[PDB]
C-alpha cells in the first residue's frame, strides 16, 4: 500500500515465513547448486573445493529467499483483503444463490450405448 | 453347513438305491472302498490334525457395515462434500448390485446342470427370477459409460420417470 515500499508495514500483521519453510528449503537448494556451478565452471574439485564460497552461496540465496517469500504472502494477503472487502461493499453483485438439489434440478441424460 | 442354502438353494436330493440285476461284481463299488480307505481316510486324519490346531488359536473378522448416509438427490448442486459421500456410497451399491446379479445367474447356472434333459421346464422358477434381476440392473446402470457417476444414473432414472409419466397421461 506504501508506495515504493518493499515491505510495507502492514505486512508485519502477518505471521513471518517459518525457517523451515519448503520454499525456503529450495532456494537454499539452489544457493547450493550455484556454489557448485562455481566450482565446475573455474575447474575445481566440485564438491569439496571453497567451503566457504560454497557457504556463502547458500546463505546470501536464503537470505534474499526469505524476503522475497515474506513480500510474495504479503502480496496474496493484501489481494484476498481487497477482494473480501469489495464484494463486500457490493452485495447486490455477489447474491446469494438458493441452491437446488439434484433431485430438483432437472438435467438431461446422455446415454453411451 | 458353510453357506446359507436361502441365497444358494439345492433341491433335496433323491438318490435310486442300487437294484443289481447282474450276477457279476460292480467294479465301482470295490474301487469306492479303495478310494475310502486309500485316500479319504488318510486325507481325512490329516486334516483333522489341521483342525485341532486351528482350535487352539481361534480369532475372528467381521463383515464391514456401512452406515447409510443421504443419496445424491439430497446433494445440494456442486456441494462436494455431500456428494463426494452420496457417490461413494452410490459406488458401493453398484457393486453389491452387481454381485446380486452373480448370485442369481449362478442360481440359473447350477439349475440347468442339475436338472438335466429336464431343465427347460424345471428351470422355470430361476429364469423368470434371473429376467426380472436383469431387468431391474438394466433400468439402474446401463448404459451410462464408463464415466459413470450418482448423477448420470439420477438423470437416467428422471428421464425414465418422465416417459412412464406421459404414457400414464396418454391411459
Ligand atoms: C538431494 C540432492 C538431489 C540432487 C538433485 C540434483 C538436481 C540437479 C542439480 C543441478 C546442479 C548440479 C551441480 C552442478 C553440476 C556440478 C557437477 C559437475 O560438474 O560434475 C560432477 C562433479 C564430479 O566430477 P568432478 O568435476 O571431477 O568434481 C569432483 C567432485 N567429486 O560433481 C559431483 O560429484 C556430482 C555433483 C552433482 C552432479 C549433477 C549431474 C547433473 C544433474 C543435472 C540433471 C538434471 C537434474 C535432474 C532433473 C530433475 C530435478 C530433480
Ligand atoms: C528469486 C528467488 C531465488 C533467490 C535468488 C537469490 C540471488 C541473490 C543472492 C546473491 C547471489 C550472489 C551470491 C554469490 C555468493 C558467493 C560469494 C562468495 O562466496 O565470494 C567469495 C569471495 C568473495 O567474497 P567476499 O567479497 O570477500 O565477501 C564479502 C562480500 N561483501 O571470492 C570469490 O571467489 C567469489 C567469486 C565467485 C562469485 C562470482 C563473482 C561475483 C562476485 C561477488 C562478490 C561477493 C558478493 C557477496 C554476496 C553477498 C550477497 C548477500
Ligand atoms: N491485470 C492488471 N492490469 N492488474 C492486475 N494485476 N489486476 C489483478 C488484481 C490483482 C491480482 C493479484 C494481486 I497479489 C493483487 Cl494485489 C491484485
Given at each position: 500500500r506504501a508506495t515504493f515500499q518493499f515491505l510495507p508495514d502492514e505486512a508485519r500483521s502477518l505471521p513471518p515465513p517459518k525457517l523451515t519453510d519448503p520454499r525456503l528449503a529450495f532456494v537454499g537448494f539452489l544457493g547450493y547448486c550455484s556454489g557448485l556451478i562455481d566450482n565446475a565452471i573455474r575447474r575445481?574439485?566440485?564438491?569439496?573445493?571453497?567451503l566457504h564460497r560454497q557457504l556463502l552461496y547458500i546463505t546470501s540465496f536464503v537470505f534474499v529467499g526469505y524476503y522475497l517469500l515474506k513480500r510474495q504472502d504479503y502480496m496474496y494477503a493484501v489481494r484476498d483483503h481487497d477482494m473480501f472487502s469489495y464484494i463486500k461493499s457490493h452485495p447486490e453483485d455477489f447474491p446469494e444463490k438458493d441452491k437446488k438439489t439434484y433431485g430438483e434440478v432437472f438435467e438431461e441424460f446422455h446415454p453411451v450405448r | 453347513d458353510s453357506w446359507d442354502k436361502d441365497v444358494y438353494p439345492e433341491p433335496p436330493r433323491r438318490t435310486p438305491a442300487p437294484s443289481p440285476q447282474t450276477s457279476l461284481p460292480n467294479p465301482i463299488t470295490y474301487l469306492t472302498k479303495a478310494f475310502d480307505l486309500l485316500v479319504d481316510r488318510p486325507v481325512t486324519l490329516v486334516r483333522e490334525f489341521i483342525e485341532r490346531q486351528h482350535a487352539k488359536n481361534k480369532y475372528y473378522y467381521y463383515h464391514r457395515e456401512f452406515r447409510r448416509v443421504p443419496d445424491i438427490t439430497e446433494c445440494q448442486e456442486k456441494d462436494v462434500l455431500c456428494m463426494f459421500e452420496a457417490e461413494m456410497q452410490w459406488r458401493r451399491d453398484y457393486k453389491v448390485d452387481q454381485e446380486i446379479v452373480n448370485i442369481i445367474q449362478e442360481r440359473l447356472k447350477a439349475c440347468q446342470q442339475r436338472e438335466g434333459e429336464s431343465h427347460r421346464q424345471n428351470c422355470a422358477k430361476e429364469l423368470e427370477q434371473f429376467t426380472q434381476v436383469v431387468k431391474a440392473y438394466q433400468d439402474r446402470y446401463?448404459?451410462?459409460?464408463?464415466?459413470?457417476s450418482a448423477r448420470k444414473c439420477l438423470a437416467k432414472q428422471k428421464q425414465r420417470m418422465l416417459a412412464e409419466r406421459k404414457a400414464a397421461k396418454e391411459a
Open positions: 575445481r574439485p566440485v564438491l569439496l573445493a571453497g | 446401463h448404459d451410462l459409460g464408463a464415466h459413470y
